[PDB]
Structures are given as C-alpha cells and as structure tokens.
Short mmCIF file of C-alpha atoms in Angstrom, two decimals:
data_model
loop_
_atom_site.label_atom_id
_atom_site.label_comp_id
_atom_site.label_asym_id
_atom_site.label_seq_id
_atom_site.Cartn_x
_atom_site.Cartn_y
_atom_site.Cartn_z
CA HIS A 1 0.00 0.00 0.00
CA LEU A 2 3.11 2.15 0.44
CA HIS A 3 6.49 2.12 -1.29
CA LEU A 4 8.58 2.46 1.85
CA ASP A 5 11.82 4.44 1.64
CA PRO A 6 14.56 1.83 1.03
CA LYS A 7 16.53 3.45 3.87
CA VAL A 8 13.77 2.88 6.42
CA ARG A 9 13.09 -0.54 4.92
CA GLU A 10 16.69 -1.70 5.11
CA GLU A 11 16.91 -0.21 8.61
CA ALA A 12 13.77 -2.05 9.74
CA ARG A 13 14.99 -5.27 8.11
CA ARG A 14 18.29 -4.97 10.01
CA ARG A 15 16.62 -4.49 13.39
CA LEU A 16 14.25 -7.44 12.83
CA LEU A 17 17.08 -9.71 11.65
CA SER A 18 18.79 -8.76 14.89
CA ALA A 19 15.59 -9.44 16.84
CA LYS A 20 15.29 -12.79 15.03
CA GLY A 21 18.92 -13.66 15.75
CA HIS A 22 18.27 -12.76 19.38
CA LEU A 23 15.16 -14.97 19.55
CA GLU A 24 17.11 -17.89 18.08
CA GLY A 25 19.55 -17.27 20.91
CA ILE A 26 16.82 -17.64 23.53
CA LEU A 27 15.68 -20.82 21.75
CA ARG A 28 19.18 -22.28 22.01
CA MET A 29 19.47 -21.21 25.66
CA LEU A 30 16.20 -23.00 26.33
CA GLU A 31 18.07 -26.17 25.36
CA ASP A 32 20.39 -25.82 28.36
CA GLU A 33 19.56 -27.25 31.79
CA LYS A 34 20.48 -24.48 34.24
CA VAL A 35 18.52 -21.81 32.35
CA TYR A 36 17.17 -19.17 34.76
CA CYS A 37 13.62 -17.87 34.63
CA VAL A 38 14.77 -14.25 35.04
CA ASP A 39 17.18 -14.49 32.10
CA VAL A 40 14.41 -15.66 29.79
CA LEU A 41 12.13 -12.82 30.89
CA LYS A 42 14.88 -10.23 30.45
CA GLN A 43 15.84 -11.43 26.97
CA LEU A 44 12.20 -11.64 25.90
CA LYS A 45 11.78 -8.02 26.97
CA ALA A 46 14.84 -7.22 24.84
CA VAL A 47 13.26 -8.76 21.74
CA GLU A 48 10.09 -6.81 22.57
CA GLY A 49 12.04 -3.58 22.84
CA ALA A 50 13.52 -4.20 19.39
CA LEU A 51 10.09 -4.86 17.84
CA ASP A 52 8.73 -1.63 19.34
CA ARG A 53 11.55 0.26 17.61
CA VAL A 54 10.57 -1.21 14.23
CA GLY A 55 6.94 -0.43 14.93
CA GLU A 56 7.87 3.19 15.54
CA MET A 57 9.68 3.37 12.19
CA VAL A 58 6.69 1.88 10.42
CA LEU A 59 4.25 4.12 12.29
CA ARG A 60 6.44 7.12 11.39
CA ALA A 61 6.33 6.35 7.67
CA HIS A 62 2.62 5.56 7.81
CA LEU A 63 1.80 8.89 9.46
CA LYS A 64 4.03 11.05 7.25
CA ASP A 65 2.19 9.62 4.27
CA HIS A 66 -1.37 10.20 5.53
CA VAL A 67 -0.55 13.47 7.31
CA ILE A 68 -7.49 5.70 8.06
CA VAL A 69 -7.81 6.79 11.70
CA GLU A 70 -9.98 3.90 12.91
CA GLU A 71 -7.72 1.37 11.20
CA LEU A 72 -4.61 3.00 12.68
CA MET A 73 -6.10 3.18 16.16
CA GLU A 74 -7.20 -0.45 15.92
CA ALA A 75 -3.58 -1.37 15.16
CA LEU A 76 -2.13 0.66 18.04
CA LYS A 77 -4.56 -1.04 20.43
CA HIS B 1 16.18 -23.70 37.25
CA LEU B 2 13.17 -23.13 35.00
CA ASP B 3 10.93 -26.20 34.99
CA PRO B 4 11.80 -28.60 32.12
CA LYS B 5 8.14 -28.78 31.00
CA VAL B 6 7.79 -24.99 30.84
CA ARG B 7 11.15 -24.88 29.08
CA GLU B 8 9.81 -27.27 26.43
CA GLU B 9 6.53 -25.38 26.04
CA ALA B 10 8.47 -22.09 25.86
CA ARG B 11 10.65 -23.53 23.10
CA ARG B 12 7.64 -24.63 21.06
CA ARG B 13 5.99 -21.23 21.39
CA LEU B 14 9.09 -19.19 20.63
CA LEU B 15 9.82 -21.29 17.56
CA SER B 16 6.45 -20.26 16.14
CA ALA B 17 7.00 -16.64 17.20
CA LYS B 18 10.33 -16.82 15.37
CA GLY B 19 8.61 -18.14 12.25
CA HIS B 20 6.06 -15.30 12.56
CA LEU B 21 8.91 -12.80 12.86
CA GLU B 22 10.38 -14.04 9.57
CA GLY B 23 7.03 -13.38 7.96
CA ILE B 24 7.36 -9.74 8.97
CA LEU B 25 10.86 -9.75 7.50
CA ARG B 26 9.47 -11.02 4.18
CA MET B 27 6.78 -8.33 4.20
CA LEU B 28 9.46 -5.67 4.56
CA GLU B 29 11.75 -7.18 1.92
CA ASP B 30 8.99 -6.33 -0.53
CA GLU B 31 9.00 -2.87 -2.10
CA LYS B 32 5.29 -2.34 -1.45
CA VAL B 33 4.33 -2.41 2.23
CA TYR B 34 0.99 -2.34 4.06
CA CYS B 35 2.18 -0.37 7.11
CA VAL B 36 -0.90 -1.14 9.21
CA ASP B 37 -0.68 -4.85 8.38
CA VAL B 38 2.94 -4.73 9.53
CA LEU B 39 2.01 -2.89 12.74
CA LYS B 40 -0.61 -5.55 13.42
CA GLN B 41 1.80 -8.41 12.74
CA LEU B 42 4.35 -6.80 15.09
CA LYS B 43 1.79 -6.52 17.87
CA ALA B 44 0.77 -10.13 17.27
CA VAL B 45 4.36 -11.33 17.70
CA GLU B 46 4.70 -9.16 20.81
CA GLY B 47 1.55 -10.79 22.16
CA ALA B 48 2.97 -14.26 21.62
CA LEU B 49 6.18 -13.22 23.38
CA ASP B 50 4.16 -11.80 26.29
CA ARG B 51 2.25 -15.10 26.63
CA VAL B 52 5.51 -17.02 27.00
CA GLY B 53 6.81 -14.44 29.44
CA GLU B 54 3.54 -14.91 31.31
CA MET B 55 3.91 -18.68 31.40
CA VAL B 56 7.48 -18.53 32.68
CA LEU B 57 6.60 -15.93 35.34
CA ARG B 58 3.66 -18.03 36.56
CA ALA B 59 5.84 -21.14 37.03
CA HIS B 60 8.55 -19.01 38.65
CA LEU B 61 5.92 -17.60 41.03
CA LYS B 62 4.03 -20.83 41.78
CA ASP B 63 7.46 -22.12 42.72
CA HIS B 64 7.83 -19.37 45.32
CA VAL B 65 13.59 -13.43 49.66
CA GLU B 66 15.37 -10.12 49.05
CA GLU B 67 17.49 -11.61 46.26
CA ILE B 68 14.48 -13.40 44.76
CA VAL B 69 12.28 -10.29 44.63
CA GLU B 70 15.18 -8.06 43.59
CA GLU B 71 16.00 -10.17 40.53
CA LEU B 72 12.35 -10.54 39.52
CA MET B 73 11.62 -6.80 39.65
CA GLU B 74 14.82 -6.28 37.68
CA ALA B 75 13.56 -8.69 35.02
CA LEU B 76 10.08 -7.18 35.05
CA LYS B 77 11.22 -3.54 35.00
CA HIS C 1 -5.76 23.74 19.03
CA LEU C 2 -7.45 20.77 20.69
CA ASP C 3 -11.15 20.66 19.82
CA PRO C 4 -13.25 22.50 22.45
CA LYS C 5 -15.63 19.54 22.78
CA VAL C 6 -12.68 17.21 23.29
CA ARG C 7 -11.17 19.45 25.96
CA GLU C 8 -14.54 19.36 27.73
CA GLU C 9 -14.93 15.59 27.58
CA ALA C 10 -11.29 15.21 28.62
CA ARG C 11 -11.82 17.39 31.70
CA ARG C 12 -14.85 15.40 32.79
CA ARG C 13 -13.04 12.10 32.34
CA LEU C 14 -9.92 13.33 34.09
CA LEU C 15 -11.92 14.78 36.97
CA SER C 16 -13.26 11.29 37.70
CA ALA C 17 -9.81 9.78 37.20
CA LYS C 18 -8.51 12.24 39.80
CA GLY C 19 -11.35 11.30 42.15
CA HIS C 20 -10.39 7.64 41.64
CA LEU C 21 -6.76 8.52 42.33
CA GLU C 22 -7.69 10.02 45.71
CA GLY C 23 -9.40 6.75 46.54
CA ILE C 24 -6.10 4.92 46.09
CA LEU C 25 -4.54 7.57 48.32
CA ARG C 26 -7.08 6.82 51.06
CA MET C 27 -6.42 3.08 50.72
CA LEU C 28 -2.70 3.66 51.32
CA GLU C 29 -3.30 6.07 54.19
CA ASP C 30 -4.75 3.01 55.88
CA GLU C 31 -2.28 0.97 57.93
CA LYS C 32 -3.83 -2.24 56.61
CA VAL C 33 -3.65 -2.53 52.81
CA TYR C 34 -4.83 -5.02 50.19
CA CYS C 35 -1.88 -4.95 47.77
CA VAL C 36 -3.75 -6.76 45.01
CA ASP C 37 -6.72 -4.38 45.18
CA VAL C 38 -4.35 -1.41 45.13
CA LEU C 39 -2.62 -2.84 42.05
CA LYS C 40 -6.02 -3.29 40.42
CA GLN C 41 -7.16 0.24 41.29
CA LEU C 42 -3.92 1.65 39.85
CA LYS C 43 -4.36 -0.29 36.62
CA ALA C 44 -7.95 0.93 36.49
CA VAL C 45 -6.85 4.56 36.81
CA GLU C 46 -4.15 3.94 34.21
CA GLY C 47 -6.87 2.62 31.91
CA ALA C 48 -9.03 5.71 32.34
CA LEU C 49 -6.03 7.91 31.51
CA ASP C 50 -5.31 5.78 28.43
CA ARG C 51 -8.89 6.23 27.19
CA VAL C 52 -8.54 10.01 27.46
CA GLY C 53 -5.20 9.93 25.64
CA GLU C 54 -6.90 7.76 23.03
CA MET C 55 -9.69 10.28 22.52
CA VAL C 56 -7.28 13.20 22.24
CA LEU C 57 -5.03 11.29 19.83
CA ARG C 58 -7.98 10.30 17.62
CA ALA C 59 -9.25 13.88 17.26
CA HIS C 60 -5.67 15.02 16.60
CA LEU C 61 -5.42 12.41 13.83
CA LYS C 62 -8.85 12.93 12.24
CA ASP C 63 -7.71 16.52 11.78
CA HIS C 64 -4.49 15.64 9.93
CA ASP C 65 4.28 20.85 8.10
CA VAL C 66 4.14 17.05 7.90
CA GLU C 67 7.70 16.58 9.15
CA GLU C 68 7.19 18.75 12.24
CA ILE C 69 3.70 17.34 12.91
CA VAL C 70 4.87 13.72 12.98
CA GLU C 71 8.02 14.60 14.93
CA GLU C 72 6.00 16.15 17.76
CA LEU C 73 3.44 13.34 17.83
CA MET C 74 6.02 10.55 17.98
CA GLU C 75 7.66 12.63 20.69
CA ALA C 76 4.41 12.67 22.66
CA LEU C 77 3.68 9.01 21.97
CA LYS C 78 7.34 8.69 22.95
CA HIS D 1 -4.34 -7.96 54.22
CA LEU D 2 -0.88 -6.49 54.79
CA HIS D 3 0.50 -3.97 57.28
CA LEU D 4 2.65 -2.12 54.75
CA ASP D 5 5.91 -0.58 56.02
CA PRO D 6 5.13 3.07 56.95
CA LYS D 7 8.27 3.86 54.95
CA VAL D 8 6.82 2.38 51.75
CA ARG D 9 3.34 3.66 52.57
CA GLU D 10 4.49 7.25 53.02
CA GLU D 11 6.63 6.98 49.90
CA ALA D 12 3.77 5.67 47.74
CA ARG D 13 1.51 8.30 49.31
CA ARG D 14 3.93 11.11 48.44
CA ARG D 15 4.26 9.94 44.83
CA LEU D 16 0.48 9.64 44.43
CA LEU D 17 -0.02 13.07 45.94
CA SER D 18 2.35 14.43 43.31
CA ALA D 19 0.58 12.39 40.63
CA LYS D 20 -2.73 13.87 41.77
CA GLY D 21 -1.17 17.33 41.83
CA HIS D 22 0.02 16.79 38.27
CA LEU D 23 -3.43 15.60 37.16
CA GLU D 24 -5.08 18.68 38.65
CA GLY D 25 -2.59 20.70 36.63
CA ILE D 26 -3.69 19.03 33.41
CA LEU D 27 -7.32 19.68 34.36
CA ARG D 28 -6.50 23.37 34.79
CA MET D 29 -4.59 23.49 31.50
CA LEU D 30 -7.64 22.01 29.80
CA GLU D 31 -9.43 25.18 30.87
CA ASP D 32 -7.17 27.25 28.63
CA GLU D 33 -8.11 27.79 24.98
CA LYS D 34 -4.72 27.27 23.33
CA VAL D 35 -3.89 23.84 24.77
CA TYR D 36 -2.00 21.54 22.39
CA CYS D 37 -2.92 17.88 21.88
CA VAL D 38 0.70 16.71 22.25
CA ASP D 39 1.11 18.45 25.62
CA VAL D 40 -1.94 16.69 27.03
CA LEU D 41 -0.65 13.34 25.74
CA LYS D 42 2.81 13.98 27.17
CA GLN D 43 1.58 15.04 30.60
CA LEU D 44 -0.85 12.13 30.74
CA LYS D 45 2.09 9.84 30.00
CA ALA D 46 3.87 11.45 32.96
CA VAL D 47 1.00 10.77 35.34
CA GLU D 48 0.98 7.16 34.12
CA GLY D 49 4.71 6.88 34.68
CA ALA D 50 4.28 7.94 38.30
CA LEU D 51 1.45 5.43 38.84
CA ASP D 52 3.71 2.68 37.49
CA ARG D 53 6.32 3.56 40.12
CA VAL D 54 3.81 3.23 42.96
CA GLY D 55 2.63 -0.08 41.55
CA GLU D 56 6.19 -1.40 41.36
CA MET D 57 6.44 -0.40 45.03
CA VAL D 58 3.20 -2.13 45.96
CA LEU D 59 4.15 -5.20 43.93
CA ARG D 60 7.61 -5.45 45.50
CA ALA D 61 6.00 -5.33 48.95
CA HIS D 62 3.36 -7.87 47.96
CA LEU D 63 5.98 -10.25 46.56
CA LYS D 64 8.40 -10.07 49.50
CA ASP D 65 5.48 -10.97 51.75
CA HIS D 66 4.17 -14.00 49.82
CA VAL D 67 7.65 -15.23 48.93
CA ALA D 68 8.41 -15.38 52.65
CA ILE D 69 -2.62 -16.21 44.94
CA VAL D 70 -0.48 -16.47 41.80
CA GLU D 71 -3.75 -16.41 39.86
CA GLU D 72 -4.91 -13.29 41.69
CA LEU D 73 -1.54 -11.61 41.16
CA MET D 74 -1.32 -12.53 37.47
CA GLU D 75 -4.93 -11.44 37.21
CA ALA D 76 -3.90 -8.03 38.56
CA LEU D 77 -0.80 -7.73 36.36
#
C-alpha cells in the first residue's frame, strides 16, 4: 500500500534480523539445563524492545504519508 | 532452574514466534508495504512473546527473599 | 488547538480519574492494605487515563508541516 | 491484608499526591483555549509513569510478603 523508503526498509529489516537472531539465541538457551527464569524474561523483553523500535519506524512512515484513523487506532490497540 | 516442561513449552511457542517474525521480515523485503498490516503483525508477535513471558513468570511464582524479589523486579522492569 | 468539545470531555473524564486517584490515596493512608486491590485500582486509573489519551489522539489524527507534525506526535507518543 | 511498612506507605503516598497534583494541573490546562494535543498526551504519560512507580512499590511489597494467589496476582498484572 506504500512504497517504503529503502533506507527505512533496510533499517527495519536490520533491526528485525537482529531481533530474530536474538530470539534464536533464547531458543538455544532453552536447550540448556540451568537456564534461569529471570534471564528468559529479560531477553524476551529485549526482543520486545527491538520490535517496538521497528513499529515506531513503520508508524512514522505511515503517518508522514497520511498526514485511516480507525484502522490505525485499531492497530495501536 | 526453570521447569523442564515450561522450558519445552516455551521452546515450542518461541519457535512459532520466530517463524512469525520471519514473515514480517518477508513483508518488509517487498518494495510495497501495508504499514498497518505490519504494525498488526508486530503486535501479534509481541503478544505471543508476552504469553511465553507470562507462562514462565507463573511457574517461577508458583514455585515461590530479598534476592528473589530483587532479581524478579529487575527482570520485570 | 485541541477541539473545544474534546477538551470538555477530557476534563470530565480526568476529573473522575482524579477522584479515583484520591481513593487509592485513602487506601494507602490506611495501615492495613490489600496490595492486590491497590494494584487493580492503579491499573484501572491507568486505563481511564489511556482512554482520554486515546480520545485526544484520535481527534488530533482525524484533523491531519508534515515533518514537524509527525516529529512532535512521535515525541508525545514517545 | 498487609501492614505495609510506613516507609513504603508514606513513599507511595507522596508519589500519588504528586501524581494527583500533576493531574489537577492538566485539568487546569484544559481550561485554557490554546492547549495543544501533544502536551496533554505527554503530561498524561507522565501521570501514568508515576502510577507505574507506585505499583512497582506495591508489587515489590506484595511479593516479598508472599515469597516469605499467583492467579490473583497474574490477574492483577
């Protein structure tokens, strides 16, 4: 629906690849025996923080374009 | 140590979340992007992550001073 | 500027939120406290605040210097 | 259900009083004619941030106690 600026696209793709790499790390850690509950929670929050950052970039580009409301709101909620 | 059963369930759930994350990557690697669809997919993945975080916290809590609480709050905050 | 009707609705909703907030204050000013209820009341007040922010955001959006506009918004949304 | 430490109680009380003071400020600002949407959103976010701090205080106290139910807590979180 939008031809995203390659710069924002490549930037978002980099942050998600990182998020993905990080999630694969948690998956591997979950293969170990002495894995701590707190470590899992912390790392999950880290992946979440990275996704939020990508969401902001996408939201930014979406708004700049349109600056529709119900659909946007529905997505933010 | 995180319960082995929760560990297994967490692995299964995060593997799917990881697959979902790659779907978002593919959406971005396309020149045309539906920003709101992407925002929704991101929230969906965040929701799946939250559910696993919820499951691990619950087991960690059912299980259960200063050190304990301190580490938990650190993980939560 | 923020729609006059929105400012009005926002004041009414925030006045109740404030009244709710004082209730949490009274709960704490009590030597005996139900932690779980206090956590629930807080989340309830947080929800009322969110609904007001939601209303204000919506009106702000329905209305819409693109660059500057988005910059400020994202700054508010933080 | 719990005889909260006067120290924590007075601290949570002080922070809520400030939160309330801040909310009454927003209410007054909403009486002005040139109020900006972003300012309201920002200040509301500030009130929320202060409420989160009091909750983290109440949660820490709740946890220390019970570590020394899970459904009710999760339910509240």
